[PDB]
Each structure stands twice: as C-alpha cells, then as structure tokens.
Amino acid sequence: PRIDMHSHFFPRISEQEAAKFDANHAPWLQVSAKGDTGSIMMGKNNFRPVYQALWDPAFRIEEMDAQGVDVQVTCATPVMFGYTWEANKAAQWAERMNDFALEFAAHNPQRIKVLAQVPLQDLDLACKEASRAVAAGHLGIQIGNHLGDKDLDDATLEAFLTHCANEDIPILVHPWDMMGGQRMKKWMLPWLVAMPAETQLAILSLILSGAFERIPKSLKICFGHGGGSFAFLLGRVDNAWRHRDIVREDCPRPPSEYVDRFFVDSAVFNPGALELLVSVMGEDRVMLGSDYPFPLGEQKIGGLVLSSNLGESAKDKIISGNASKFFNIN
Amino acid sequence: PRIDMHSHFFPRISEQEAAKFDANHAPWLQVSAKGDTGSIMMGKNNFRPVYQALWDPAFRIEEMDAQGVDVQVTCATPVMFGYTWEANKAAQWAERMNDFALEFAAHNPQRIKVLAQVPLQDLDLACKEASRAVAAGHLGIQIGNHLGDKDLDDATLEAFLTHCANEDIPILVHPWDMMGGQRMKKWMLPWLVAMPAETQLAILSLILSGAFERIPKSLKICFGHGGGSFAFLLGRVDNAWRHRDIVREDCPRPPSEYVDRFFVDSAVFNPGALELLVSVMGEDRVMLGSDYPFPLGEQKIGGLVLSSNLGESAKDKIISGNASKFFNIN
Ligand SMILES: [Zn+2]
Ligand SMILES: [Zn+2]
C-alpha cells in the first residue's frame, strides 16, 4: 500500500462565514467563474488561486486512484493557521477548521486521514484543541515552524510538543510566514530559499537548545520538505559545535546524533538529495510526502522514491511502513 | 601541490588609522594583553576576538607548512567591506585595504595570493578599484553576496560581474550581513542557517533572473561554503521552474543547467555533502577552501577532500588543479 502524509486541504468556507471571525483576515474560498478554479480570499482581496482538488474530496479520491495513493494524510493550508489572531477567536477558528477537516475525511475516512491545527498563541488553548481533535478522529497536529520571533526552542513551543509527546499525538512541522524582508520578491524565492531555511532553523532550534534532552523520547515529530536544508548542512553544524563553546552551551552531544528523535518527509525532488537524506536520517525516518495539490509539489506522487536505487525494503518503509507506524494507520 | 583558495586576513590597522575614515564604523585591530590574542574593534567597542594567524603572515606561513598548504589565497574579512559608507570614503578604504593585502602577501608572494575588495555601493568606483587592484598583483575580487536589498540580479551588481568578466578578473562571492531579524540570537544560528541561505539566494538570483544569459561565459565566479544549500535544494528549484510560469519568466532553461557557469569551494564539512556537491557541480568546479583561520573553518585543511572516495584524478583537481586554472597560479 501507499501513504502520502503531506498534503493540504482548504474548506468550502463562505465569505459570510469568514466575516464572522474577521472580515479582513479570515480566509475564505471563492469557487467561481467555472467551478474548477478557486481563489483563497481575504476580505475582498484575492490571495492565491487554487484548484479543485484542494477542496473537493470526491475529485481528490479520483486523482488519488490515478496516482495510486491508497491513504493520504492531509491538513490545513498554512494561511488558515491564524497565529496572529486574538487567542479565544483563534481557538474557535481552529475548532471549526478541524471539524471541516473531519468533514472532508468523512467522505472516505479509510483513505483520507486528517491532522489538526491549534491556536498556538495560547498554550492552554492549544493543548486542549490538540487533545480534542485527536479524540474526534484526527491522527495528529500540524503547526507552523515558528510563532513570530519565538522559534521551537521557546519554552511555550517546547511545552506544546511535550504535551503531544505525553499523549501519543504526532506532529507535522511546516514552514510558514517566511523570513526575508523585502529581498525575495521574484521567482518564488521565498519558497526556494526561505522555506527550507525556516525548516532547518526549526530543527536546529530544538537540537541546539537541548530541547530533545527535555522532550520525552515518545515525541513523534516530522518536518516538511525533507527537513529543508538541514541534512545537507549538518556537517557544518557539527563542525561549529566542536569549535565554539557558545554552540555547545545547551547541547551536550554532537548535533547530528539527534536525528533519532524526529522524522522528515521525502519531498526533495532529486535522487541524490533523497539518497543523502536517507543516509542522514535512516530508512526508518523518511516518509513519502508530496505537498499535493500544490504546484511546487510532486506531480507523480512517490515517483522519486520508487525510481531510486534504495533497497526495496527501504522503498517500502518510506512509501508505507514508516507512516503506518508514525500515524497508526492500517 | 595544494591551494587553499578561501581564507581571510585582517590588517594591523591602528585605532588612529581607522578613526581617520570613521571612528564609529571603521574596524581596527587590537593585538593586546599577550599579543597572540587580538580583537577586531569598532570605535571603542570590541566586535570579535581573533587569533594571530589572521594578521601575522610569518606565523601563518608556519601553520601553512604544518597543514601542508603550498599556496593560500586570502582576502578581506567581511567586516572590512564598508558597503554602508559614503562612496568616495569607501573607495579610499578599499584602496588602503588592498594595499595592506599586497603588503601581507609580499612576505611570501609565491605562497600567499590576495583578492581585493571594492566599494560596491558605486559601480564606477568599484570597477576602477577592481582593475587597479588586479594590475597591482591581486588575483581577483571578493565581494559580499548582497548590497542591502539589492541581490546579485540587480543591474548594478550584474554590471560589476560583467566588467570583471570582460577583464579576466575572477570573483569570490561571500555571504555577509545576514538576513534574519531578531530570530537567530543563539548558538551562532546566523552562521548555520542564514549564511548558507544567503549564498543560495545569490546563486538563484543570478540563475532565475537570467543573468547568465547576459553575463559573458568568460566570468569566473565562485561561491563560498559549497554554495550554501544551493546544490541540495536544486531539484526543488527545477521542480518549481517546471510548474510555475512566474519562476520561468526570466530563466529560459532549467536552473540546474547553469552549474557550468560558476564554481564553489569544497567547505561543506561532510563526505556525503561533498559527494553530492561534486555530483552536481562536476569535479572541475569545486576548489579546496577552508575558511582559515576562523573556528567554523576546516581545522585539518583539505582533510575532507583527501579522505573521500573520489577518484584520485578528482581529488587532484579540487585540491590544486581547479584553483590553478581559476586564479592563474603556478
Ligand atoms: Zn505543504
Ligand atoms: Zn569566509
């Protein structure tokens, strides 16, 4: 069988629905002109054109059959996170969005699994929504990689991971709200430079802060897009750790030794990069993920892993065996 | 023989010398307490502790003998760039610094080669200093990777590369003045996350802008630290280019096809990363570089390349043959 554990949905939310939370900032879906083109909206302004597989589970199931994807885990589009909003408002938003998700999956719950969002700007609310959404059927949580200037080393965010660790709740960390200023205005550079940097920064924030020394081993956590550039730049991190005490101050072992504490998806779009990723992380900690249905995703889902020269025992863990164990899927 | 083409110096500049350009912003060297520890200074404030190999060519030659480095190409520490200063002031600074460099190399010009800086905030001055410094003995130019929000696609910076291309002047691009805001305050994250991102951004700015379609093939240009994360994230760039017209708008061929237009050093601190780097760039376009004498440099210069399983014909191009041809060294 074949699991795709990285994919997005966006719910059919009317403009009126969105306007009851925040007319200016709550995103909604406009399936207009000829109803296979939509645009995520915000207030009266467009935000991103999207296509119908983002919102239509019946359509999506047929693309899945075409691709050969038995089970697809899917979760919020990051524009739905709402980490800027007032806490209680965002906890209500998260709850709605996660009901939408379970409604999306209900069309075929055996083949469409969902992960939840949480109102991460309030730790108590966020832990509550995580437990409630997993009880209601979500298989885990998807969070953005940072909360403004708080990166994953910040005690609030570490405490959220530790809550999920203590409840067997898995987490997918997705880059979002990208660093950069005004420098990456063309050619989708934020997605090519800032996004992998964001994800590396999140992994290094956990490692170099010594967060894995405090977070129980039971945490199941996965970083999108192969972990960004993390695996390629790891030798540079180890070298810095061996030669500067300020890099060692909170991290008592070589940084590269902490790759037995997390997972990455396989979406690196290159056979040599995949071979290096599996060399660094081990065949047990890479899961097939496509970023479906977005353009910078993998158009032939699983094609990179299947066409590699990894042993077939490795190919089976990545396309299937690892995400069965990680999310608890049959 | 063995060339190390990435290394830094800093001149014995007094505080009084620095204060005649700018007391607050011009950096100077304080070889104090016990004269093998110095600190780069700025005004009355410290900036970075450095050790004597940064400023002492006689000392440096003995470390070179110890390491087995026949020829070392060295260039400014990026804090000496002065890209913020008023143009004419900075052109005078650059000229002084480049005289210092030739004075540094004069102690053994056959084994110490120098690259120059330029006052990149004025294109006419910058082209003039490049030609004058190469005529006086520099083997090329080292520039920072961006000038504020102008990245290498900006016409000013492309015109500077094109000037050097048309005069057979080689260039080393070094990351500096790192993106990030207030998010990377600990554990030297700017050097681990922002620096490789900066260098990838510089390479992608040339490729995706179509600058290599305008810059003559004669340009010899090298990017520090293996090109940052560029080589690992290249498949992700190609995928984006195949699937979004805005990524193609200025770049008429697949981005990965432009790796025959530039060079990288070999400083990636990991055998798998080096193998992938040589797979992407080819054995002809990677040059041994150490970042000597800094802590995040390679402590056993050339040890990574020599201990690899590259063919010995590949090991010879990288440690020696490529930088002989790139800088014109015997
Ligand atoms: Zn995604
Ligand atoms: Zn350097």
XYZ file of C-alpha atoms and ligand atoms in Angstrom:
662
model
C 0.000 0.000 0.000
C 0.962 3.715 -0.328
C 0.519 6.587 2.151
C 1.094 10.247 1.234
C 1.446 12.022 4.589
C 1.994 15.614 3.421
C -0.874 17.305 1.602
C -3.252 20.159 2.145
C -6.937 20.932 2.041
C -8.894 24.126 2.311
C -12.575 24.065 3.392
C -15.534 25.453 1.469
C -15.891 28.471 3.754
C -18.177 31.251 2.556
C -17.216 34.905 2.768
C -20.017 35.362 5.301
C -18.608 32.535 7.452
C -15.133 34.110 7.392
C -16.527 37.569 8.159
C -17.944 36.379 11.491
C -14.403 35.798 12.783
C -12.574 38.592 10.962
C -13.656 40.096 7.645
C -10.160 41.432 6.904
C -8.025 38.475 7.947
C -10.091 35.281 7.907
C -9.546 33.405 4.617
C -12.420 32.008 2.580
C -12.877 30.088 -0.672
C -14.289 31.503 -3.925
C -15.074 28.618 -6.313
C -16.133 30.977 -9.065
C -16.124 31.521 -12.869
C -16.123 27.841 -13.941
C -16.051 25.985 -10.614
C -12.788 24.085 -11.019
C -10.788 27.253 -10.387
C -10.953 28.814 -6.955
C -9.087 31.522 -5.125
C -8.358 31.625 -1.445
C -9.682 35.041 -0.488
C -9.176 37.507 2.335
C -11.696 40.269 2.888
C -12.469 41.430 -0.628
C -8.955 40.692 -1.967
C -7.614 37.558 -3.647
C -4.683 35.750 -2.068
C -3.872 32.622 -4.053
C -5.521 30.783 -6.952
C -6.129 27.123 -6.088
C -7.625 24.190 -7.933
C -10.491 21.931 -7.066
C -8.521 19.035 -5.566
C -7.795 21.362 -2.624
C -11.495 21.456 -1.622
C -13.244 18.516 -3.330
C -12.772 15.131 -1.615
C -14.687 13.294 -4.355
C -12.427 14.773 -7.037
C -9.361 14.182 -4.815
C -10.203 10.474 -4.376
C -10.109 10.034 -8.139
C -6.748 11.770 -8.500
C -5.598 9.504 -5.644
C -6.756 6.431 -7.579
C -4.984 7.780 -10.665
C -1.750 8.331 -8.696
C -2.023 5.035 -6.851
C -2.297 6.661 -3.401
C -4.250 4.386 -1.028
C -4.182 6.682 2.043
C -3.475 10.422 2.021
C -2.963 12.343 5.257
C -3.973 15.958 4.738
C -4.033 19.083 6.857
C -4.646 22.817 6.827
C -3.207 25.169 4.326
C -0.901 27.371 6.460
C -2.900 30.539 5.627
C -5.616 29.042 7.910
C -3.322 28.962 10.977
C -4.400 32.295 12.448
C -1.437 32.640 14.809
C -1.790 36.454 14.700
C -5.403 36.474 15.960
C -6.714 37.018 19.487
C -6.467 33.751 21.406
C -10.113 32.781 22.018
C -11.131 33.817 18.493
C -8.363 31.611 17.056
C -9.303 28.646 19.254
C -12.827 28.886 17.825
C -11.378 29.130 14.296
C -9.135 26.110 14.912
C -12.109 24.121 16.198
C -14.194 24.982 13.140
C -11.314 24.218 10.746
C -10.708 20.836 12.381
C -14.422 19.946 12.135
C -14.215 20.889 8.430
C -11.213 18.540 8.177
C -13.114 15.624 9.729
C -15.983 16.514 7.385
C -13.542 16.395 4.459
C -12.257 12.970 5.582
C -15.748 11.601 6.321
C -16.326 11.131 2.574
C -13.801 8.296 2.764
C -12.260 8.057 6.258
C -10.394 4.873 5.394
C -8.345 6.624 2.674
C -8.360 10.283 3.827
C -6.829 10.975 7.268
C -6.620 14.464 8.766
C -4.256 16.396 11.052
C -5.471 19.342 13.110
C -4.384 22.909 13.653
C -4.123 24.580 17.076
C -4.229 28.176 18.358
C -0.524 28.122 19.207
C -0.512 31.700 20.548
C -2.124 30.355 23.783
C -0.520 27.241 25.217
C -3.509 26.116 27.300
C -5.999 26.509 24.454
C -3.536 24.843 22.056
C -3.050 21.733 24.216
C -6.818 21.481 24.702
C -7.557 21.631 20.969
C -4.868 19.043 20.217
C -6.407 16.515 22.629
C -9.971 17.276 21.492
C -9.147 16.977 17.769
C -7.254 13.704 18.165
C -10.151 12.286 20.245
C -12.588 13.289 17.465
C -10.561 11.411 14.781
C -7.516 13.492 13.731
C -4.310 11.486 13.622
C -2.135 14.362 14.840
C -1.361 18.074 14.674
C 0.209 20.285 12.023
C 1.798 23.516 13.287
C 3.770 26.287 11.639
C 7.504 26.187 12.371
C 7.651 29.441 14.337
C 5.383 31.865 16.187
C 6.817 35.222 15.190
C 10.240 35.562 16.770
C 9.622 32.538 19.004
C 11.248 29.537 17.350
C 10.813 25.933 18.540
C 13.352 26.403 21.374
C 10.947 28.830 23.104
C 9.546 27.219 26.250
C 5.936 27.715 25.165
C 6.524 25.716 21.969
C 8.600 23.038 23.679
C 5.804 22.614 26.222
C 3.318 22.052 23.399
C 5.461 19.302 21.855
C 5.874 17.772 25.316
C 2.100 17.752 25.803
C 1.659 15.937 22.482
C 4.529 13.612 23.340
C 2.822 12.644 26.607
C -0.474 11.881 24.786
C 0.943 9.927 21.783
C -0.129 12.791 19.490
C 2.119 13.061 16.380
C 3.133 16.446 14.919
C 3.996 17.716 11.438
C 6.028 20.953 11.407
C 5.512 23.037 8.316
C 7.481 26.168 7.335
C 5.370 29.293 7.099
C 5.425 33.083 7.422
C 8.889 33.231 5.919
C 11.893 35.304 6.998
C 13.316 37.607 4.375
C 12.255 41.253 4.495
C 11.915 42.778 1.026
C 14.617 40.720 -0.658
C 12.871 37.787 -2.220
C 10.208 39.446 -4.336
C 10.571 37.458 -7.578
C 10.565 33.922 -8.956
C 9.015 32.427 -5.788
C 12.334 32.757 -3.928
C 10.531 32.633 -0.503
C 9.546 29.031 -1.343
C 13.015 28.145 -2.655
C 15.300 29.882 -0.145
C 13.286 30.988 2.886
C 11.112 27.865 3.316
C 13.990 25.316 3.550
C 15.844 27.763 5.788
C 12.787 28.057 8.057
C 12.592 24.290 8.470
C 16.350 23.910 9.138
C 16.075 26.705 11.700
C 13.240 24.829 13.460
C 15.218 21.586 13.675
C 18.375 23.359 14.853
C 16.383 25.338 17.434
C 15.310 22.053 19.055
C 18.746 20.416 18.813
C 20.992 23.304 19.834
C 18.690 24.417 22.675
C 18.887 20.941 24.174
C 15.116 20.590 23.821
C 15.440 16.897 22.963
C 17.097 16.396 26.383
C 13.826 17.608 27.964
C 11.166 16.401 25.486
C 10.330 12.706 26.119
C 11.536 10.200 23.524
C 7.903 9.380 22.846
C 7.527 12.514 20.713
C 6.746 11.632 17.101
C 7.631 14.762 15.114
C 8.096 15.265 11.371
C 9.494 18.239 9.433
C 8.233 19.037 5.954
C 10.212 19.068 2.711
C 12.967 16.723 3.823
C 13.727 18.966 6.750
C 14.649 21.827 4.425
C 18.398 22.078 4.037
C 19.053 20.538 7.477
C 20.565 17.242 6.327
C 22.947 18.829 3.844
C 24.169 21.491 6.289
C 24.527 19.117 9.263
C 28.293 18.629 8.958
C 28.668 22.424 9.113
C 26.639 22.417 12.338
C 28.718 19.622 13.908
C 31.912 21.473 12.984
C 30.627 24.672 14.611
C 29.654 22.672 17.694
C 33.140 21.120 18.025
C 34.862 24.516 17.741
C 32.731 27.121 19.570
C 31.641 26.796 23.189
C 28.629 29.067 22.624
C 27.272 26.435 20.205
C 27.709 23.691 22.842
C 26.306 25.602 25.776
C 22.841 23.963 25.713
C 23.562 20.886 23.551
C 25.652 18.177 25.282
C 26.159 15.777 22.341
C 27.063 16.303 18.676
C 24.000 17.789 16.911
C 23.932 15.042 14.255
C 23.282 12.410 16.946
C 19.762 13.789 17.467
C 18.430 12.505 14.107
C 16.972 9.554 16.054
C 14.483 11.998 17.626
C 12.497 13.180 14.582
C 11.282 12.389 11.067
C 11.203 14.129 7.684
C 9.084 13.712 4.615
C 10.782 12.631 1.375
C 9.855 15.691 -0.762
C 13.300 16.798 -2.005
C 12.725 16.423 -5.787
C 16.114 14.846 -6.589
C 17.563 11.318 -6.327
C 20.944 12.389 -4.895
C 19.276 14.575 -2.281
C 16.998 11.664 -1.331
C 19.952 9.274 -1.017
C 21.732 11.781 1.244
C 18.538 12.314 3.268
C 18.181 8.573 3.869
C 21.897 8.319 4.674
C 21.496 11.011 7.340
C 18.088 10.055 8.773
C 17.973 6.313 8.112
C 15.373 4.435 6.075
C 13.116 4.363 9.163
C 12.602 8.124 9.490
C 11.690 9.336 5.981
C 8.020 9.217 4.918
C 6.618 9.732 1.429
C 5.063 13.185 1.213
C 4.048 15.152 -1.869
C 2.716 18.611 -0.917
C -0.359 17.765 -3.011
C -2.248 19.521 -4.603
C 0.129 22.468 -4.894
C 2.338 23.255 -7.933
C 5.640 23.045 -6.084
C 4.539 19.552 -5.019
C 5.470 16.213 -6.568
C 3.308 15.737 -9.654
C 3.873 11.939 -9.813
C 3.382 11.116 -6.135
C 6.014 8.632 -4.948
C 7.790 8.613 -8.319
C 11.087 9.793 -6.829
C 11.182 7.113 -4.114
C 10.075 4.296 -6.450
C 12.642 5.172 -9.133
C 15.562 5.308 -6.680
C 18.160 2.582 -6.110
C 17.294 2.182 -2.442
C 16.772 -1.417 -1.441
C 13.168 -2.486 -1.906
C 12.967 -2.929 1.872
C 13.861 0.772 2.150
C 11.387 1.791 -0.576
C 8.614 0.000 1.338
C 9.259 1.696 4.675
C 9.251 5.143 3.044
C 6.201 4.799 0.820
C 4.195 2.951 3.507
C 5.762 1.243 6.530
C 7.014 4.365 8.329
C 3.813 6.398 8.122
C 1.692 3.385 9.184
C 3.722 3.311 12.400
C 4.028 7.112 12.750
C 0.320 7.919 12.402
C -1.102 4.477 13.420
C -2.715 3.546 10.078
C -3.765 0.117 8.799
C 50.761 20.855 -4.715
C 47.868 22.247 -2.588
C 45.975 25.551 -2.890
C 43.538 26.815 -0.238
C 41.501 29.498 -2.022
C 39.179 30.598 0.800
C 40.773 32.275 3.806
C 40.797 35.647 5.457
C 43.211 38.236 6.745
C 42.763 41.401 8.716
C 45.423 44.164 8.587
C 47.290 45.663 11.528
C 45.285 48.892 11.444
C 45.648 51.198 14.435
C 42.678 52.855 16.094
C 44.042 56.201 14.901
C 44.186 54.921 11.304
C 40.568 53.725 11.496
C 39.421 56.983 13.097
C 40.528 58.994 10.054
C 37.861 57.264 7.948
C 35.161 56.775 10.581
C 35.798 56.446 14.312
C 32.449 54.720 14.916
C 32.341 52.316 11.984
C 35.857 51.680 10.673
C 37.246 48.439 12.160
C 40.734 48.214 13.625
C 42.917 45.567 15.268
C 43.850 45.419 18.968
C 46.682 42.891 19.448
C 46.673 43.356 23.196
C 47.141 41.549 26.555
C 49.562 38.825 25.369
C 49.914 39.559 21.647
C 48.606 36.287 20.230
C 45.035 37.277 21.063
C 43.509 40.188 19.207
C 40.063 41.657 18.849
C 38.663 43.329 15.794
C 37.448 46.627 17.203
C 34.991 49.321 16.199
C 35.178 52.730 17.821
C 35.823 51.907 21.456
C 33.824 48.639 21.383
C 35.009 45.092 20.708
C 33.486 43.175 17.817
C 35.143 39.778 17.503
C 38.127 38.086 19.157
C 40.600 36.813 16.555
C 43.897 34.983 16.721
C 47.282 35.869 15.370
C 47.170 33.852 12.139
C 44.599 36.402 10.915
C 47.198 39.222 10.941
C 50.666 37.615 11.046
C 51.960 36.329 7.686
C 55.116 34.885 9.269
C 53.047 32.901 11.773
C 50.559 31.965 9.013
C 53.331 30.568 6.774
C 54.312 28.164 9.536
C 50.749 26.962 10.085
C 50.611 26.553 6.286
C 53.748 24.391 6.377
C 52.220 22.397 9.235
C 48.973 21.880 7.278
C 50.763 21.164 4.019
C 49.279 24.186 2.207
C 51.650 25.356 -0.556
C 49.582 28.351 -1.762
C 46.806 30.080 0.187
C 44.583 32.686 -1.454
C 43.318 35.091 1.187
C 41.053 38.112 1.235
C 39.305 40.620 3.464
C 37.314 39.731 6.480
C 33.765 40.815 5.505
C 33.598 43.377 8.357
C 36.114 45.402 6.260
C 33.740 45.693 3.267
C 32.277 49.082 4.164
C 29.280 48.826 1.835
C 27.300 51.182 4.119
C 29.821 54.051 3.877
C 29.770 57.110 1.620
C 31.125 56.140 -1.793
C 34.397 58.095 -2.057
C 35.309 57.342 1.567
C 34.784 53.614 0.913
C 36.820 53.683 -2.305
C 39.705 55.130 -0.282
C 39.180 52.444 2.386
C 39.116 49.702 -0.260
C 42.335 51.041 -1.775
C 44.079 51.082 1.601
C 42.808 47.590 2.494
C 44.014 46.183 -0.828
C 47.472 47.748 -0.344
C 47.529 46.108 3.115
C 46.659 42.817 1.380
C 49.546 43.128 -1.089
C 51.728 44.052 1.894
C 50.525 40.899 3.667
C 51.338 38.775 0.589
C 54.703 40.478 -0.033
C 56.219 38.467 2.840
C 55.915 35.427 0.579
C 54.129 36.312 -2.687
C 54.766 32.877 -4.156
C 52.707 31.154 -1.426
C 50.292 33.920 -0.314
C 47.971 35.321 -3.018
C 45.411 38.046 -2.325
C 41.947 39.025 -3.586
C 40.697 42.599 -3.347
C 37.612 44.314 -2.028
C 35.693 47.030 -3.906
C 33.359 49.885 -2.913
C 30.344 48.115 -4.406
C 27.918 50.923 -3.496
C 29.288 52.907 -6.506
C 29.603 50.945 -9.728
C 32.150 53.237 -11.400
C 34.443 53.368 -8.370
C 34.034 49.601 -7.887
C 35.059 48.713 -11.455
C 38.025 51.086 -11.193
C 39.293 49.538 -7.953
C 38.914 46.019 -9.354
C 41.107 46.817 -12.376
C 43.651 48.751 -10.288
C 43.974 46.016 -7.635
C 44.379 43.213 -10.172
C 47.031 45.279 -12.024
C 48.904 45.767 -8.718
C 49.019 41.979 -8.031
C 45.641 40.781 -6.670
C 44.379 37.647 -8.372
C 40.722 38.689 -8.209
C 37.942 40.282 -6.173
C 35.965 39.149 -3.143
C 32.539 40.772 -2.697
C 29.706 40.282 -0.245
C 26.720 38.403 -1.674
C 24.251 41.290 -1.476
C 24.171 45.075 -1.138
C 21.267 45.606 1.229
C 18.081 44.638 -0.571
C 19.895 44.501 -3.920
C 20.775 40.874 -4.601
C 23.012 39.712 -7.471
C 20.169 40.044 -10.022
C 20.219 43.846 -9.557
C 21.604 45.501 -12.688
C 24.331 47.338 -10.780
C 25.741 44.053 -9.447
C 25.372 42.217 -12.748
C 27.256 45.055 -14.440
C 30.110 44.643 -11.960
C 30.416 40.915 -12.699
C 30.282 41.709 -16.420
C 33.114 44.221 -16.028
C 35.237 41.587 -14.275
C 34.221 39.007 -16.862
C 35.433 41.282 -19.668
C 38.824 41.795 -17.935
C 39.525 38.149 -16.905
C 39.128 39.170 -13.243
C 37.880 36.255 -11.066
C 35.382 36.795 -8.222
C 34.688 35.078 -4.898
C 31.189 35.720 -3.500
C 30.995 35.514 0.253
C 27.808 35.604 2.369
C 27.628 38.540 4.741
C 25.255 40.878 6.578
C 22.801 38.061 7.140
C 19.011 38.067 6.794
C 17.085 37.091 9.884
C 15.707 39.900 12.038
C 15.789 39.055 15.747
C 15.280 35.316 15.388
C 18.710 33.793 15.380
C 20.227 35.164 18.564
C 21.814 31.995 19.989
C 24.219 29.187 19.131
C 25.645 31.009 16.078
C 22.487 30.254 14.069
C 23.237 33.164 11.625
C 26.326 31.201 10.504
C 24.444 27.889 10.337
C 21.111 28.925 8.805
C 21.373 32.453 7.406
C 24.829 32.183 5.781
C 24.073 29.121 3.569
C 20.706 30.675 2.741
C 22.420 33.932 1.724
C 24.733 32.099 -0.663
C 21.909 30.008 -2.202
C 19.915 33.214 -2.649
C 22.860 34.800 -4.511
C 23.218 31.864 -6.904
C 19.467 31.660 -7.529
C 19.286 35.429 -8.085
C 21.736 35.071 -10.989
C 20.104 31.938 -12.428
C 16.427 32.837 -12.115
C 16.948 36.434 -13.296
C 18.554 35.141 -16.476
C 21.758 36.991 -15.594
C 23.892 34.185 -17.026
C 22.188 34.808 -20.403
C 23.666 38.341 -20.312
C 26.966 37.852 -18.432
C 29.686 36.566 -20.820
C 30.793 32.954 -20.381
C 34.239 34.270 -19.528
C 33.108 35.121 -15.991
C 34.999 33.068 -13.413
C 32.863 33.245 -10.261
C 32.990 31.177 -7.070
C 30.540 30.984 -4.151
C 31.772 30.263 -0.645
C 30.903 27.297 1.563
C 29.935 24.914 -1.214
C 27.393 27.386 -2.480
C 25.461 27.197 0.787
C 22.489 24.889 0.450
C 22.177 25.521 -3.310
C 23.216 22.073 -4.537
C 20.946 20.188 -2.159
C 17.897 22.358 -2.901
C 18.412 22.426 -6.688
C 15.850 19.727 -7.507
C 13.262 21.784 -5.599
C 14.160 24.784 -7.768
C 13.888 22.800 -11.023
C 10.505 21.451 -9.923
C 9.248 24.973 -9.181
C 10.547 26.111 -12.567
C 8.704 23.317 -14.430
C 5.403 24.096 -12.675
C 5.115 27.891 -12.248
C 5.391 30.367 -15.109
C 6.487 33.164 -12.758
C 9.617 31.107 -11.992
C 10.362 30.725 -15.730
C 9.690 34.299 -16.731
C 13.365 35.384 -16.864
C 15.098 31.971 -16.988
C 14.732 30.121 -20.326
C 16.390 26.795 -19.404
C 16.147 24.521 -16.355
C 18.004 26.226 -13.465
C 20.254 23.200 -12.843
C 21.762 23.563 -16.333
C 23.555 26.751 -15.245
C 26.060 24.934 -12.978
C 28.541 25.181 -15.878
C 28.678 28.955 -15.259
C 30.151 29.130 -11.736
C 32.304 27.443 -9.095
C 32.038 26.615 -5.391
C 34.573 25.930 -2.709
C 34.584 22.491 -1.063
C 33.926 23.624 2.552
C 30.859 21.517 3.443
C 32.323 19.540 6.396
C 30.809 16.159 5.450
C 31.737 13.400 2.973
C 28.179 12.798 1.706
C 27.616 16.512 1.171
C 30.917 16.716 -0.733
C 29.990 13.746 -2.935
C 26.641 15.391 -3.733
C 28.370 18.731 -4.393
C 30.752 17.115 -6.882
C 27.857 15.198 -8.451
C 26.001 18.477 -9.013
C 28.909 20.755 -9.980
C 31.370 18.292 -11.506
C 34.932 17.625 -10.366
C 36.073 20.648 -12.414
C 34.158 23.311 -10.477
C 34.879 22.604 -6.790
C 38.015 24.135 -5.229
C 39.528 23.329 -1.843
C 38.716 26.134 0.578
C 38.977 26.163 4.364
C 37.744 29.488 5.802
C 41.070 29.669 7.662
C 41.820 30.925 10.316
C 38.282 31.050 11.689
C 36.740 28.496 14.106
C 33.920 27.433 11.808
C 36.633 26.662 9.240
C 38.231 23.314 8.433
C 40.838 22.613 11.104
C 42.700 19.990 9.000
C 42.798 21.853 5.689
C 41.993 19.506 2.800
C 41.338 16.560 5.126
C 37.768 16.104 3.890
C 38.722 16.007 0.197
C 41.751 13.739 0.741
C 39.806 11.222 2.845
C 36.947 10.922 0.334
C 36.443 8.112 -2.187
C 36.580 10.438 -5.175
C 38.922 9.224 -7.873
C 42.448 10.499 -7.335
C 42.074 12.464 -10.577
C 39.115 14.225 -8.929
C 40.996 14.775 -5.651
C 43.809 16.459 -7.603
C 41.595 18.910 -9.478
C 39.887 20.001 -6.248
C 42.923 20.386 -4.009
C 45.014 22.009 -6.776
C 44.183 21.767 -10.486
C 40.973 23.826 -10.459
C 42.282 26.797 -8.489
C 45.499 26.911 -10.572
C 43.294 27.446 -13.626
C 40.716 29.657 -11.857
C 43.178 32.142 -10.349
C 46.120 31.566 -12.783
C 48.627 30.131 -10.275
C 51.756 28.064 -10.933
Zn 2.980 21.745 2.473
Zn 34.956 33.028 4.764
